[PDB]
Amino acid sequence: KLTLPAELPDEQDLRAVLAYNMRLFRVNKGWSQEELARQCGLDRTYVSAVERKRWNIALSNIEKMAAALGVAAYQLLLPPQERLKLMTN
Amino acid sequence: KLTLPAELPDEQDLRAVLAYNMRLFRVNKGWSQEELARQCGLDRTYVSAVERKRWNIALSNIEKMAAALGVAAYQLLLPPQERLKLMTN
């Protein structure tokens, strides 16, 4: 029932890029927002707001989400358009 | 006279990875720490301390350094070992 991002993010909008990627990766893991937050030791309200681009998130919290999601931190800031471009073209 | 990083960073240490990359890219541009700080509208003391891994830097400041350096934000978090691996292997 876990839904993916509806639209591609502006590649320049780093918050939008992060939010897209967080949601894509957590959904691939079968994780709700709440579950991702529990995995990182972050407040579920905070994680949900990050996905709505509300917070100037610190590097340490990027690092924790990336560790919980099992990806390199830089993959959270890599626009999905670029990832796909590299992956399939 | 602008010197490059002395050692490769621990790829897991995101602060170390950022500091390596900031210094590599700014040196490629002919920029001191002070100059990079002026380019981003950041305090030179703060930029110098980021390169010594002292600060839990926010996403907005990552974005500003990346815009001043003319690179994608995610390249600041991409370990130089990986970059080289992709670039030449």
DSSP for B20-82?
HHHHHHHHHTT--HHHHHHHHT--HHHHHHHTTT----BHHHHHHHHHHHTS-HHHHTS-HHH
From CA A74, how far away is CA A22, in angstroms rounded? 12
Left, alpha or beta for A57 (phi > 0: left; psi -120 to 50: alpha)? beta
B71 CB near a chain A CB, below 8 Å?
A: no
Burial of B6 (0-12, 13-18, 19+ CB in 10 A): exposed
Q: Encoding tokens for residue B56? A: 């839990």
Resolution in A for the shown PDB structure? 1.9
Q: Encoding tokens for residue B48? A: 């110098």
From CA B32, how far away is CA A78, in angstroms rounded? 27
Give the list of residues 6+ apart from residue B49 with CB closer than 8 angstroms, or none: B55
Domains of chain B with bracketed CATH: 1-89 (1.10.260.40)
Q: Residue B58: beta bridge partners?
A: A58
From CA B35, how far away is CA B6, in angstroms rounded? 20
What are the C-alpha distances in Å from B30 to residues A33, B4, B27, B36, B38? 43, 11, 5, 10, 13
Give the list of residues 6+ apart from residue B13 with CB closer than 8 angstroms, or none: B53
Q: How many CB atoms lie within 10 A of CB A6?
A: 7
A59 CB near a chain B CB, below 8 Å?
A: yes
Cβ(A83)–Cβ(A11) below 8 Å: no
**What count of CB pairs under 8 Å joins A to B?**
52
